[PDB]
From a paper:
The arenavirus genome comprises two ambisense RNA segments encoding four viral proteins: immature glycoprotein precursor polyprotein, nucleoprotein (N), large RNA-dependent RNA polymerase (RdRp) (L), and zinc-binding matrix protein (Z). The L protein is a multi-domain, multi-functional protein responsible for transcription and replication of the viral genome. The Z protein mediates multiple functions through interactions with viral and cellular proteins including negative regulation of viral RNA synthesis, orchestration of virus assembly and budding, and countering host immunity.
The final density maps for the monomeric and dimeric L–Z complexes were highly similar to the apo MACV L protein structure, except that additional densities were observed that were designated as Z protein in subsequent model building. Structural comparison revealed that the monomeric L–Z complex was nearly identical to one monomer of the dimeric complex; superposition of the structures yielded root mean square deviations (RMSD) of 0.5 Å, suggesting that contacts between the L and Z proteins were identical in the two structures. The structure of the L protein in the monomeric and dimeric L–Z complexes was also highly similar to those of apo L protein monomer and dimer; superposition of the structures yielded RMSD of 1.2 and 1.3 Å, respectively, suggesting no major conformational changes following binding of Z. Considering the high similarity of the monomeric and dimeric L–Z complexes, only the monomeric complex is discussed below. Previous structural study showed that there was no large conformational rearrangement between apo and vRNA-bound MACV L protein, especially in regions required for Z binding. It implies that the Z protein might interact with L in multiple structural or functional states, such as the monomeric and dimeric L protein in both apo and vRNA-bound states.
Author numbering: 2 to 175, 180 to 305, 321 to 461, 468 to 513, 520 to 804, 820 to 874, 886 to 922, 950 to 1039, ...
The structure:
């Protein structure tokens, strides 16, 4: 108490500006007493930051610190039976209110677990307070520190720095486990250095239960089983086995009997059980339509562009919502469109027939704005309807397209042009064909597919790609887009959403459907030869899955001819297998599902089995799944029959077995062409959770809700410990009950004690010892909105608009500024839709209800007849109203559609209004907003409005002043639930909060659990602990490349020796193991670092994995609420209801292993136990295997003296390795001909290319920023694809595919763009710098206009190398811009000015010229701050072809424009300069209007020759030379041969050399490297440094010999 007199005068600089300081300081001065001084003398800061966070927001400070129900009852309000919690600030008027908290942390660690508990605390009030007639916006004040205004941030740290002795002095002078937590609460901005010593500085209190955990856990271990006693028992165990259970048949292997499994396959796949046909097109509904189109159409205009132009004009004017309601905003421009249609009928004699029946309209059909086929006659009604409803209508709505509008409107008269309907009747009854029809829910003639020539076989896939693109841009339709008529097995088609596609110059096709969005529609495909319609089928599928083949006709064609070309030896057999494989590819392309996918992946297991000589005996028992349709059988007869076609011939059909295996394997990986998406989300997450919990509860460890930090009840603990001791039971010599997870703890003692002795290949060495914001809920993961965001941003925008109208008294809402703030902070009509269209349908229907409930939560602010009985109110209205408790989440099958018409159609009173009033002031929306969908055609949303409308919404205190457990929350920064004395089973704070997620792998969904922050904070130390372990280990590869490479090489040279090697995997490696197994492993580890030859301490390691042992895996709500309505887990959760009927949310278990959570800790277990099993085999079977493990895959390479008769050994390995719950998968294969390791199949004499995986990989993962970066992605993946020795021609065909993906997207083209076509060598010698060089200098083919600028490249580069400086400061000649840099260069080289003339009109049009293609700095900075700082493939592409038609291209002038407008700034300059490449290269006079986008190509060509001199070269200057035979498929491994002249280890050599280049660029954020750190400072698209800080990644390339001597050369 030496500062207690100073402590009064210290906060004497706090003037009582309010009541929050006056009474608080007059009670501060009236007693010198240290006993409440840490409480009463410190609560002034508990008043200050409280009031300040209340001083910021709209807040009336209740200094009483009281509850929710009496603050509602201070006015005249009956108390609504609220639960009572504590807020500290209100704003209560109207019929809504504001509860607010404040929480402040410097750590990221429990700053989030406070907000989670806070919003959970006020959102267990949403069940009860919303029913009172009042909503609330529970707002929080997240703070990293103390941001106060009534103090100037200078005395609060004196309050933490001078009181930091006074609690030490008082706790000496005078609470104990509320002493150091006050220390941990009063910390500054900590660099709180947490290592493995993190557990050491807590208390370690216990539970008086963990003794039984150890008593269940550490008994059978001694770590002291002698190495002679291991051999003695293990020899007798082998002698026990070899007479025990090998010969009586409980093994798992056989000799495969290679003939017999062929028959097993024939009975497996060739479904003689099925009712399926032979010709496949009869069976599936889409192949019907394909074979219709390609053999009803292969045997076989200024008004065009005018109609298309004015149609796109209608699309542009439609995206406004400026017709004050959402129904006329289609129909007035429909009137415009049909007026132009009759004006086209009034244009020529043959106008609406000869170029329109062959055009965009067919018989009784009109095409217009969105994609709407409208089928003319209805519009003849509708305008008659609309002029029926408003007789005086086209008087204001026409020149509202001029006034309050851009007024750029190219319409001749069609605005006010109320047409003669009789004139429209003339065209309408002129042409009528059959109306389109759609089908829900025998005969056969399809030319027997292989009875055709090979030429029309691509005409198949062209129609496939044409209908595929139609399915693609089916998505491109707007996602709300509600039509004009609502409302079944066979439906006459009134007006449909309908895409298009060409086929030839006359006949085009369509695609008919009704539902908007992403989900499955019921399609219908009609052709029109010359106007004559034809239905040609009606199928059912889902759009977002056919993103693959959109132009891959040449791509699949290249592989369907390429793979077929592997049979150059059996010509007629090749002539058989060719066409069937192409139809096979078609059928797989026809049917994406999970079943056909998983099957076709599952064929390599059989193929490795027939290739090798031993399988696991249960593989064919699981190599089929049940066909849910008749469609899965179609693929399951052909490749299966193809297996039958060339595995077992009646003669010796194993001749060229290597090509056979390669071929059929690439057939089997041709599975992977199905886009891995698990066709729906809610049937995936339940399937993933059933994959999660079924072996668990079969092993029997399901418990219900823990306390989430620590303590348990007795009974849940009992089944916990029951599973624990049942786990380790599993004796060393029982052969039954072996498929149960666990281990003989005493055989674990053999393994770990022989490990402690240094006779394994690994030991306890342990070099360099390991001892060194928006947050969601947990029950909806796999999605992209939490529930807490969906109240967070709602409350933010609600409180923001709560401010704007009570400054002056506006008292009105803006119906688009209520849609502007949310559209800003999540992702002015054009300013909204400028980035509003950059969303997803999941995001669209979320944003709609966000619009809804923000409009509701602002409609609640100004708030201060059921006798129209149609149906029973107690059976339709109020019964469903109380079953739902919400008018909002009302379903659609409990009612019908017409009751949403008729009871919604109640007559007008003060419940409705007319003259819809798009001003819309607040508080009157109860009659104003309700008529918005009454005057739209829709019925559901107004029904929700009308049912939510009309009130259907119904001294001890001085000692406990020092805050103990009875007084925790009375501060905010008291740091309540930090660890203070950590639990034996928990971290004292959380209990390892996890959730559910899948991964979408090829066959099965690999899982992931949802970590919290502290859970990951503990996960990191354990996984990097094992990382430092496995670095000292010798036979792991989860992160090491080198040992994996040596495993590869010795694997190959074992296979070339003709030696034997296994290949495993592990069925349910994830859900099997438990943390306590790994604790028991860690118990008998010595871990003697060679620093200190001594057993290290593991109590920070052993007691932290106890917390993993008791983890909280949550449940998805989508697996929880799907089980609510009415599959053994679905059976199990319904008997969790007949217990204590809480919903099973929090679930803890024993044996979990999040995959990638404790992964490497299993890897050392999966290393050491593997080497232990490997160790016996040198003494039990006198052979030397070597076993690698990548923590989920394993391999043992067997060395045999002087043939598979030692299967005696082999399943015995299983019989050993099954005992340690590393269960041998039924998918494993062991033999001597084919060995894997992670899809690297190392067969005799060669190596498997595995073509179609990478080929599929390029045709997937087309994600979208820029056609540099997007075409950098497929540039990368083409580097990977040609690493495997595919060809060159496939690569260019992929390049042409992605080129056409650009070209369809409306970017147009550029010689940067996609990479080149026909690239023959460039992959081998060099990165993108040489590829863009070849692409650009193949344009200048005569090699006379660009050899000059490469001469300039030599005259610059040989002066800018060593030996001479010669302006190494070129730093500012370049950075001025594009042209004038090159003008300095070219005169610097030595020539005339005439070259500077003749070159610099070579121009191209850049669209990310000045900035980017904005679809929401030089990118060099981003690559450096990426490397230096350390929604499918279809569904982005639609937001890519939509956010390219927007307002996108920028000038340096502030503002944006369109791509076609830049292409409207064009001319034609036929003299040899524009005419070099059409719409690619320009004259300057061809762009004399807009030449500022006309950047020069030759500047970037010069910079490319310098980058080709940077990253490699001194041959890249030279002339492209002339090449000048072998087997076509004699492919082999070639080497890079790159001559690099830079200096290596660049990672600091460029970052420090950004200062020497441009100062503010790194101020806010060698000999040669800096001159091309300078060739990407000013521009963006060279590709320089990114592939010199990272590496080429392959260096080993294999290619065909016909891609080497056929390739060019560029010698110096």
């Amino acid at each position: 108490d030496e500062y207690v007199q100073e402590l009064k005068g210290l906060i004497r600089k706090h003037i009582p500006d309010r009541c929050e300081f006056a009474h608080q300081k007059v009670t501060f001065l009236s007693q010198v007493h240290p006993s409440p001084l840490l409480t009463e003398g410190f609560k002034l800061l508990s008043s200050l930051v409280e009031l300040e966070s209340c001083e910021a927001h709209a807040c009336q400070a209740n200094t009483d610190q009281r509850f929710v129900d009496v603050i509602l009852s201070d006015n005249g309000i009956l108390c609504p039976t609220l639960p009572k919690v504590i807020p500290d600030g209100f704003k209560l008027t109207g019929k809504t209110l504001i509860l607010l908290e404040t929480f402040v942390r410097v750590n990221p660690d429990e700053f989030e677990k406070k907000w989670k508990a806070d919003m959970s605390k006020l959102l267990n009030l949403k069940h009860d307070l919303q029913k009172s007639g009042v909503t609330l916006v529970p707002i929080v004040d997240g703070r990293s520190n103390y941001n106060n205004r009534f103090v100037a941030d200078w005395v609060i740290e004196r309050m933490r720095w001078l009181l930091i002795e006074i609690l030490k002095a008082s706790k000496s002078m005078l609470e104990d486990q509320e002493y150091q937590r006050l220390i941990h609460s009063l910390s500054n901005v900590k660099n709180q250095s947490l290592g493995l010593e993190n557990l050491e500085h807590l208390k370690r209190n216990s539970l008086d239960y963990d003794e039984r955990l150890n008593e269940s856990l550490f008994i059978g271990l001694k770590g002291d089983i002698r190495e002679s006693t291991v051999r003695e028992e293990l020899i007798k165990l082998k002698m026990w086995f070899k007479d025990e259970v090998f010969s009586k048949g409980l093994g798992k292997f056989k000799l495969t009997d290679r003939r017999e499994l062929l028959e097993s396959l024939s009975s497996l796949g060739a479904h003689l059980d099925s009712d399926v046909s032979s010709c496949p097109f009869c069976n599936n509904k889409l192949m019907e339509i394909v074979y219709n189109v390609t053999f009803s159409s292969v045997e076989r205009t200024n008004i065009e562009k005018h109609y298309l132009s004015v149609l796109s004009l209608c699309n542009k004017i439609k995206g406004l919502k400026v017709f004050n309601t959402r129904r006329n905003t289609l129909l007035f421009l429909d009137l415009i469109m049909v007026n132009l249609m009759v004006d086209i009928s009034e244009s020529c004699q043959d106008a609406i027939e000869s170029l329109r029946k062959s055009g965009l309209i067919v018989g009784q059909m009109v095409m217009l704005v969105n994609d709407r086929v409208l089928d003319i006659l209805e519009a003849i009604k509708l305008i008659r309807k609309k002029i029926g409803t408003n007789p005086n209508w086209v008087k204001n709505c026409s020149k509202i397209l001029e006034r309050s509008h851009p007024e750029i409107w190219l319409q001749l008269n069609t605005l006010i042009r109320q047409p003669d309907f009789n004139s429209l009747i003339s065209i309408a009854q002129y042409l009528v064909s059959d109306r389109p029809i759609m089908r829900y829910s025998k005969i056969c003639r399809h030319k027997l597919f292989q009875e055709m020539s090979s030429f029309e076989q691509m005409r198949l896939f062209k129609t496939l790609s044409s209908i595929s693109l139609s399915l693609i841009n089916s998505m491109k339709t707007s996602f709300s887009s509600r039509l004009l008529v609502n409302e079944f097995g066979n439906v006459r088609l009134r007006e449909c959403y309908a895409q298009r596609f060409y086929l030839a110059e006359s006949l085009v096709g369509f695609l008919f459907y009704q539902k908007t969005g992403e989900r499955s529609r019921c399609y219908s495909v009609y052709l029109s030869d010359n106007g004559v319609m034809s239905e040609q089928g009606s199928f059912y599928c889902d759009p977002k899955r056919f993103f693959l083949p959109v132009f891959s006709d040449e791509v699949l064609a290249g592989m369907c001819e390429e793979m077929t070309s592997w049979l150059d030896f059996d010509t007629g057999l090749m002539n058989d297998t060719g066409p069937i494989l192409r139809l096979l590819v078609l059928a797989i392309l026809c049917s994406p599902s999970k079943r056909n996918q998983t099957f076709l992946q599952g064929l390599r297991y059989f193929l490795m089995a027939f290739a090798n000589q031993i399988h696991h005996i249960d593989l064919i028992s699981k190599l089929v799944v049940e066909c849910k349709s008749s469609s899965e059988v179609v693929v399951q007869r052909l490749a299966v029959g193809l297996f039958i076609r060339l595995l077992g011939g009646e003669s010796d059909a194993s001749s060229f077995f290597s090509r056979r295996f390669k071929y059929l394997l690439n057939v089997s990986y041709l599975c992977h062409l199905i886009t891995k998406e698990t066709p729906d989300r809610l049937t995936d997450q339940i399937k993933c959770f059933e994959k999660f919990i079924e072996p668990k509860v079969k092993f029997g460890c399901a418990v219900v809700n823990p306390s989430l930090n620590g303590k348990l009840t007795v009974d849940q603990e009992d089944i916990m410990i029951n599973g624990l001791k049942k786990f380790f039971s599993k004796s060393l010599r029982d052969t039954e009950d072996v498929q149960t997870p666990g281990v003989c703890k005493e055989l674990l003692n053999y393994c770990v004690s022989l490990f402690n002795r240094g006779k394994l290949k690994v030991s306890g060495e342990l070099k360099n010892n390991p001892f060194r914001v928006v947050i969601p809920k947990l029950d909806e993961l796999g999605n992209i909105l939490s529930t807490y965001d969906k109240e967070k941003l709602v409350s933010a925008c609600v409180s923001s608009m709560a401010e704007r109208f009570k400054t002056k008294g506006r008292y009105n809402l803006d119906p688009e500024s209520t849609d502007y703030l949310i559209l800003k902070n999540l992702t002015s009509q054009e300013e909204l839709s400028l980035m509003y269209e950059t969303l997803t349908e999941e995001q669209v229907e979320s944003f709609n209800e966000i619009k809804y409930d923000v409009q509701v939560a602002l409609a609640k602010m100004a708030d201060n007849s059921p006798f129209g009985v149609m149906k029973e109110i107690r059976a339709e209205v109020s019964l469903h109203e109380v079953k739902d408790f919400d008018p909002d989440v009302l379903p659609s099958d409990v009612y019908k559609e017409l009751c949403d018409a008729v009871y919604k159609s109640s007559e007008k009173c003060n419940f409705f209004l007319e003259e819809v009033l798009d001003v819309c002031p607040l508080g009157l929306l109860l009659k104003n907003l309700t008529t918005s969908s009454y005057m739209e055609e829709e019925y559901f949303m107004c029904f929700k409005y009308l049912l939510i409308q009309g009130h259907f919404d119904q001294a001890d205190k001085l000692d406990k002043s020092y805050f103990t457990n009875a007084a925790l929350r009375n501060l905010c920064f008291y740091s309540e639930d930090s660890p203070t004395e950590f639990t034996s089973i928990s971290s004292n704070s959380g209990n390892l909060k996890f959730g559910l997620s899948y991964k979408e792998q090829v066959g099965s969904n690999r899982e992931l659990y949802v970590g919290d922050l502290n859970t990951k904070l503990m996960t990191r130390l354990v996984e990097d602990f094992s990382e430092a372990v496995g670095n000292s280990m010798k036979y792991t590869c989860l992160n090491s490349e080198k040992e994996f490479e040596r495993a590869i090489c010795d694997m190959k040279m074992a296979v070339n020796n003709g030696d034997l090697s296994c290949s495993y995997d592990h069925s349910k490696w994830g859900p099997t193991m438990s943390p306590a197994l790994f604790l028991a492993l860690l118990q008998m580890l010595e871990l003697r670092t060679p620093v200190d030859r001594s057993k290290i301490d593991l109590d920070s390691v052993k007691s932290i994995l106890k917390w993993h042992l008791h983890k909280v895996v949550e449940v998805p709500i989508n697996v929880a609420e799907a089980y609510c309505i009415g599959s053994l887990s679905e059976e199990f959760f319904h008997q969790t209801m007949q217990l204590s009927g809480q919903i099973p949310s929090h679930i803890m278990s024993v044996l979990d292993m999040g995959q990638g959570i404790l992964h490497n800790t299993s890897d050392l277990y999966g290393l050491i136990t593997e080497q232990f099993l490997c160790y016996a085999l040198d003494l039990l079977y006198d052979v030397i295997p070597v076993s690698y493990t990548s923590s989920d895959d394993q391999i043992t390479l067997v060395k045999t003296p002087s043939a598979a008769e030692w299967l005696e050994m082999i399943c015995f390995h299983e019989f050993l390795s099954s005992k340690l719950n590393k269960f041998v998968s039924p998918k494993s294969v062991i033999g001597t001909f084919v060995a894997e390791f992670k899809s690297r199949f190392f067969v005799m004499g060669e190596e498997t290319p595995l073509l179609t995986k990478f080929v599929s990989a390029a045709l997937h993962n087309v994600k979208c920023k820029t056609p540099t970066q997007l075409s950098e992605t497929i540039d990368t993946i083409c580097d990977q694809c040609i690493a495997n020795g595919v060809s060159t021609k496939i690569v260019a065909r992929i390049s042409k595919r992605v080129n056409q993906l650009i070209r369809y997207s409306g970017y147009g083209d550029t010689p940067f763009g996609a990479i080149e076509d026909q690239d023959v060598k460039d992959w081998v010698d060099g990165s993108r710098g040489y590829r863009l060089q070849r692409k650009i200098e193949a344009i200048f083919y005569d090699d006379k206009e660009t050899s000059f600028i490469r001469n300039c490249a030599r005259k610059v580069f040989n002066d800018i190398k060593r030996g001479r400086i010669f302006e190494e400061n070129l730093i500012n000649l370049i950075g001025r811009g594009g042209d004038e840099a090159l003008t300095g260069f070219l005169q610097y080289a030595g020539c005339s000015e005439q070259e500077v003339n003749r070159v610099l009109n070579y121009r191209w049009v850049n669209l990310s010229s000045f900035g980017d293609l904005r679809l929401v700095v030089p990118t060099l900075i981003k690559t450096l701050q990426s490397k230096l700082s350390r929604s499918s493939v279809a569904s982005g592409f639609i937001g890519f072809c939509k956010s390219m038609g927007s307002k996108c291209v920028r000038d340096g002038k502030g503002g944006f424009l369109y791509i076609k407008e830049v292409y409207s700034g064009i001319n034609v300059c036929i003299c040899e300069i524009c005419a070099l490449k059409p719409k690619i290269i320009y004259c300057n006079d061809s762009l004399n209007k807009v030449s500022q986008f006309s950047k020069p190509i030759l500047w970037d060509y010069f910079s490319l020759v310098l980058t080709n001199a940077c990253e490699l070269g001194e041959w890249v200057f030279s002339t492209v030379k002339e090449p000048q035979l072998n087997n076509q498929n004699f492919f082999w491994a070639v080497k890079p041969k790159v001559v690099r002249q830079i200096e290596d280890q660049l990672g600091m050599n460029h970052v420090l050399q950004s200062i020497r280049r441009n100062y503010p660029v790194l101020f806010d954020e060698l000999k040669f490297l800096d001159v091309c750190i300078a060739l990407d400072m000013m521009n963006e698209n060279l590709g320089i440094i990114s592939h010199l800080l990272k590496t080429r990644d392959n260096s080993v390339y294999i290619v065909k010999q016909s891609d080497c001597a056929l390739a060019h050369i560029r010698q110096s």
